[PDB]
Amino acid sequence: GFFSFIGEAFQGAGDMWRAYTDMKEAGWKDGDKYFHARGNYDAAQRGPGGVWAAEKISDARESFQEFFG
Amino acid sequence: GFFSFIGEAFQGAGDMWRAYTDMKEAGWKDGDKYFHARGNYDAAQRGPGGVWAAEKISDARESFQEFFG
Amino acid sequence: GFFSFIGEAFQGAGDMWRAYTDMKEAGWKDGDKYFHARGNYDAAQRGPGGVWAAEKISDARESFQEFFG
Amino acid sequence: GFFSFIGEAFQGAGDMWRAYTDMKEAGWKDGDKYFHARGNYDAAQRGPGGVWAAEKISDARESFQEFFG
Amino acid sequence: GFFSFIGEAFQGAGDMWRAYTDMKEAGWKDGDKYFHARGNYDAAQRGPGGVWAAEKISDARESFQEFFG
Amino acid sequence: GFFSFIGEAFQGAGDMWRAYTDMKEAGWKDGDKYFHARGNYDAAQRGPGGVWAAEKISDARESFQEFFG
Amino acid sequence: GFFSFIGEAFQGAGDMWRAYTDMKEAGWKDGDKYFHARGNYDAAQRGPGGVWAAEKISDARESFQEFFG
Amino acid sequence: GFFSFIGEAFQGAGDMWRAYTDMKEAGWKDGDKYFHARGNYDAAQRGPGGVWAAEKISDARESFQEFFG
Amino acid sequence: GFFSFIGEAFQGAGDMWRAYTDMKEAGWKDGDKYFHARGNYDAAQRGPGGVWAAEKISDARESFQEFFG
Amino acid sequence: GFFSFIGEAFQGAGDMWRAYTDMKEAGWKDGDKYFHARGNYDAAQRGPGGVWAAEKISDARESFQEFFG
Amino acid sequence: GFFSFIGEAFQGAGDMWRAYTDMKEAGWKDGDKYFHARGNYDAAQRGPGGVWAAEKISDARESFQEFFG
Amino acid sequence: GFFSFIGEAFQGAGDMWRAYTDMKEAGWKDGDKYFHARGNYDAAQRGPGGVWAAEKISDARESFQEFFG
C-alpha cells in the first residue's frame, strides 16, 4: 500500500510514526514513555497553511496555490 | 490501502501514529505513558488555514487556494 | 481502504491515531495513560479556518478558497 | 509498497519513523524513553506552508504553487 | 518497495529512521533513550515551505513552484 | 527496493538512518542512547524550501522550481 | 476566425464553398452557372446520421456516440 | 485563421473550395460553369455517419465513437 | 493560418481546392469549366464514417474511435 | 502557415490543389477545363473511414482508433 | 511555411498539386486541360482508412491505431 | 519552408507536383494537357491505410500503428 508519515513542529518521548506490515509469527514489547516539560517558552509551534491528504488528484489546473504576506 | 498520517504543532508522551497491517499469529504489549507539563507558555499552537481529506479530487480548476495577509 | 489521520495543535499522553487492519489470531495489551498539566498558558490552540472531509470531490471550479486578513 | 517518512522541526527521545515489512518468526523488545526539557526558548518551530500527501498526481498544470513574502 | 526517509532541523537521542525488510528467524533488542535539554535557545527550527509526498507525479507542467521573498 | 535517507541540520546521540534487508537467522543488540544539551544557541536549524518524495516523476516541464530572495 | 466547410453527396455546377477574408481595394466577377440533369437514377444521396456544429465542446464524457445496425 | 475544407462523394464542374485571404489591390474574373449529366446510375452517394464541426473540443473522455454493423 | 483541404471520391472539371494568401497588386483570370457524364455506373461514392473538423482537440482519452463490421 | 492538401479516389481535368502565397506584382491566366466520361463503371470510389482535420491535438491517450472487419 | 501534398488513387489531365511562394514581378500562363474516359472499369479507387491533418500532435500515447481484417 | 509531395497509384498527362519558390522577374508558359483512356481495367488503385499530415509530432509512445490481415 501507500504509507506516508509527515510530522512537523512537535516534541515527543518516542515510539511514533511506525508502519508494521505483512508479519507472521512475530511478537514484541514496547516500554513506558515519559514526557516532562517545565518552564519552556514557544514550543511546538507551526505557521500558517493547509493540509491536503489525497489518494488521487487528477487534472488539477491553476489549483492548490497559497499566497502568504 | 492508502494510509496517511499528518501531525503538526503537538506534544505527546508517545505511541502515536502507527499503522499495523496484514498480521497473522502476532502478539505485543505496550507500556504506560505519562505526560507532565508545568508552567509552560505558548505550547502546541498552529496557525491559520484549512484541512482537506480526500480520496479522489478530479478536474479541479482554479480551486483549493488560500490567501493570507 | 483509505485511512487518513490529521491532527494539529494538541497535547496527549499517548496511544493515539492508529489503524489496525486485516489481522488474524492476534492479541495485545495497552497501558494506562496519565495527563497532568498545571499552570500552563496558551496551550493547544488552533487558528481560523475550515475542515473538509470528502471521499470524492469532482469537477470543482473556483471553489474551496479561503481569504484571511 | 511506498513508505515515506518526512519530519522537520522536532525533538524526541527516540524510536521514531520506522517501517518493518515482511517479517516471519521474529521477535524484539524496545526500551523506555524519557524526554525532559526545562527552560528552553523557541524550540521545535516550523515556518509557513502546506502539506500534500498524494498517491497519484496526474496532469497538474500551473498548480501546487506557493508565494511567500 | 520504495522507502524514503527525510528529516531536517531536529534533535533526538536515537533509534530513528530505520527500515527493516524481509527478515526471517531474527531477534533483537534496543535500549532506553534519554533526551535532556536545559536552557537552550533557538533549537530545532525549520524555515518556510511545503512538503509533497507522492507515489506518482505525471505530466506536471509549470507546477510545483515556490517563490520566497 | 529503493532506500533513500536524507537528513540535514540535526544533532543526535546515535543509531539512526539504517536499512537492514534480507536477513536470515540473525540477532543483535543495541545500547542506550543519551542526549544532553545545556545552554546552546542556534542549534539544528534549516533554511527555507520544499521537500518532495516521489517514486516516479514523469514528463515534468517547467516544474519543480524555487526562487529565493 | 474559424472557417469550416463540409459537403458530401452532392452535385453542382460550381462556385461553391468559398471564404474571402480581409480584402482591400479588390474587385471580381463570376460567371453564369448551368445545371442540367436528365434521366439519372440514385443521385446525391446521403446515409443515416447526425450533424453537430459547435464552437466549443467541453468535458464531454460518454457522449456523441452513434450505433448503426 | 483556421480554414478547413472537407468534401466527399460529389461531382462538380468547378471553381469550388477556395480560400482567398489578405489581398490588397487585386482583381480577377471567373468563367461560366456547365454541368450536364444524362442516364447515370448511382452517383454522388455517401454512406452512414456523422459530421462534427468544432472550434475547440476539450477533455473528451469515451466520447465521439461510432459503431457500424 | 492553417489551411487544410481534404477531398475523396469525387469527379470535377477543375479549378478546385486552392488557397491564395497575402497577395498585393495581382490579377488573374480563370476559364470556363465543362462537366459531361453520360451512362456511367457507380461514380463518386464514399463508404461509411465520420468527419471531424477541429481547431483544437485537447486531452481526449478513449475517444474518437470507429468500429466497422 | 500550414497548408495541407489531401485527395484520394478522384478524377479531374486539372488545375486543382494549389497554394499561392506571398505574391507581389504578379499576374496569370488559366485555361478552360473539360471533363468527359461515358460508360465507365466503378469510378472514383473510396472505402470506409473517418476524416479528422485538426490544428492542435494534445495529450490524446487511447484515442483515434479504427477497427475494420 | 509547411506545404504538404498527398494524393493517391486518381487520374487527371494535369496542372495539379503546386505551391508557388514568395514571387515578385512574375507572370505566367497555363493551358486548357482535357480529360476523356470511355468504357473503363475499376478506376481511381482507394481502400479503407482514415485521414488526419494536424499542425501539432503532442504527447499521443496508444493513439492513432488502425486494425484491418 | 517544408515542401513535401507524396503521390501513389495515379495516372496523369503532366505538369504536376511542383514547387516554385523565391522568384523575382520571371515569366513562363505551360501547354495544354490531354488525358485519354479507353477500355482499361483496374487502373489507379490504392490499398488500405491511413494518411497523416503533421507539422510537429512530439513524444508519441505506442502510437501510429497499423495492423493488416
DSSP string, G38-59: ES-EEEEEE-S--EEEEEEEES
CA neighbor of D67 nearest in space, from B8, B56, A49: A49
Q: Which residues contact residue D56 at a Cβ distance below 8 angstroms, ignoring those fewer than 6 apart?
A: A55, A56, A57, A58, E54, E55, E56, E58
Q: Is B67:C66 a contact under the CB 8 Å cutoff?
A: yes
Distances (CA, A) of F26 to B23, D28, D52, E23: 21, 12, 39, 9
Residue I21 burial (CB count, 10 A): 23
DSSP assignment of H1-61:
-EEEEEEEEEEEEEEEEE--BS-EEEEEE---EEEEEES-EEEEEE-S--EEEEEEEES-B
With cell 506518482, the residue in question is E56
Cell numbers describing residue D26: 521474529
CA–CA separation, E52 and F41 (whole Å) = 31
Q: Which residues contact residue I11 at a Cβ distance below 8 angstroms, ignoring those fewer than 6 apart?
A: H11, I35, I37, I43, I44, J10, J11, J12, J35, J37, J43, J44
With cell 450536364, the residue in question is H36
* Overall residue count recorded for chain A in this entry: 69
Cell numbers describing residue B58: 478530479
Chain H positions touching I68 (Cβ under 8 A) are 68
Residue among D48, D51, D55 whose CB faces B6 most closely: D51
Q: How remote is the C-alpha of H65 from its chain's centroid?
A: 22
What is residue D55's DSSP assignment? E
Cell numbers describing residue A42: 514557544
Cell numbers describing residue H45: 452517394
E strand or H helix that includes residue F23: none
Chains touching chain G through at least 3 C-beta pairs below 8 angstroms are: H, I
Q: Is K34:L12 a contact under the CB 8 Å cutoff?
A: no
Chain D nearest C-alpha distance from F67 (Å): 10
What residue in I sits closest to K57 (Cα-Cα)? Answer: I57
CA–CA separation, J22 and J3 (whole Å) = 13
Residue among D33, D46, D53 whose CB faces B4 most closely: D53
Could you tell me the strand order of the sheet in which C41-46 lies? C41-46, B41-46, A41-46, D41-46, E41-46, F41-46
Cell numbers describing residue C47: 487558528
E strand or H helix that includes residue L60: none
Q: Looking at chain L from residue 8 to 67, which residues have their Cβ under 8 Å from any Cβ of chain K? A: 8-67
What residue in G sits closest to H33 (Cα-Cα)? Answer: G33
Sequence letter at residue D15: D
CA–CA separation, F46 and A35 (whole Å) = 25
With cell 499576374, the residue in question is J27
Could you tell me the strand order of the sheet in which G2-18 lies? G2-18, H2-18, I2-18, J2-18, K2-18, L2-18
- CA angle in degrees (0–180, nearest 5) for H61-H65-H67: 150
Q: Is H45:I45 a contact under the CB 8 Å cutoff?
A: yes
With cell 494506562, the residue in question is C32
What residue in D sits closest to F39 (Cα-Cα)? Answer: D40
CA neighbor of A53 nearest in space, from E17, B16, B7: B7
Q: Which residues contact residue I25 at a Cβ distance below 8 angstroms, ignoring those fewer than 6 apart?
A: H24, H25, H26, J24, J25, J26
CA–CA separation, D8 and G48 (whole Å) = 66
Sequence letter at residue F5: F
Tabulate helix, strand, coil % of chain B (nearest 5): 0, 70, 30
Q: Is E18:F19 a contact under the CB 8 Å cutoff?
A: yes
B35-69: burial string, b at 16+ Cβ within 10 Å, e else: bbbebbebbbbbbbbbbbbbbbbbbbbbbbbbebe
With cell 509469527, the residue in question is A25
CA–CA separation, F41 and F22 (whole Å) = 43
Say if K and L touch: at least 3 Cβ pairs within 8 Å. Answer: yes
CA–CA separation, C38 and A38 (whole Å) = 10
CA–CA separation, G44 and H45 (whole Å) = 6
Q: Is L31:K31 a contact under the CB 8 Å cutoff?
A: yes
- D33 and B47 within 8 Å at the Cβ level: the answer is no
Q: Is B61:C14 a contact under the CB 8 Å cutoff?
A: no
Q: Which residues contact residue H28 at a Cβ distance below 8 angstroms, ignoring those fewer than 6 apart?
A: G28, I27, I28, I29, I30
E strand or H helix that includes residue G9: strand G2-18
Chain E positions touching F49 (Cβ under 8 A) are 47-49, 66
Chain H nearest C-alpha distance from J30 (Å): 10
With cell 523557541, the residue in question is D42
What residue in D sits closest to A10 (Cα-Cα)? Answer: D10
Sequence letter at residue L60: A
Interface test with L, best of J11, J23, J25, J42 (most L CBs within 10 A): J11
Residue D56 burial (CB count, 10 A): 18
Interface test with H, best of G21, G38, G51 (most H CBs within 10 A): G21
CA–CA separation, J11 and C2 (whole Å) = 64
CA–CA separation, A48 and A63 (whole Å) = 18
Distances (CA, A) of H37 to G40, I11, I37, K19: 7, 12, 5, 33
Distances (CA, A) of E35 to D11, D39, E6, E56: 9, 14, 21, 38
Residue J42 burial (CB count, 10 A): 18
CB pairs under 8 A between H and J: 12
CA–CA separation, K14 and A2 (whole Å) = 67
Q: Are strands I33-38 and J33-38 parallel, antiparallel or unpaired?
A: parallel
Interface test with H, best of G2, G41, G51 (most H CBs within 10 A): G2
Cell numbers describing residue L59: 513524444
Residue C1 burial (CB count, 10 A): 9
- A53 and C4 within 8 Å at the Cβ level: the answer is yes
Q: How remote is the C-alpha of G54 from its chain's centroid?
A: 15
Q: Which residues contact residue F42 at a Cβ distance below 8 angstroms, ignoring those fewer than 6 apart?
A: E41, E42
DSSP assignment of A36-61:
EEES-EEEEEE-S--EEEEEEEES-B
CA–CA separation, E30 and C37 (whole Å) = 31
Q: Is D18:A22 a contact under the CB 8 Å cutoff?
A: no
Q: Where are the alpha helices (DSSP H) in C1-69?
A: none
- G14 and I32 within 8 Å at the Cβ level: the answer is no
- CA angle in degrees (0–180, nearest 5) for B46-B50-B51: 100
Cell numbers describing residue G43: 443521385
What residue in H sits closest to G64 (Cα-Cα)? Answer: H64
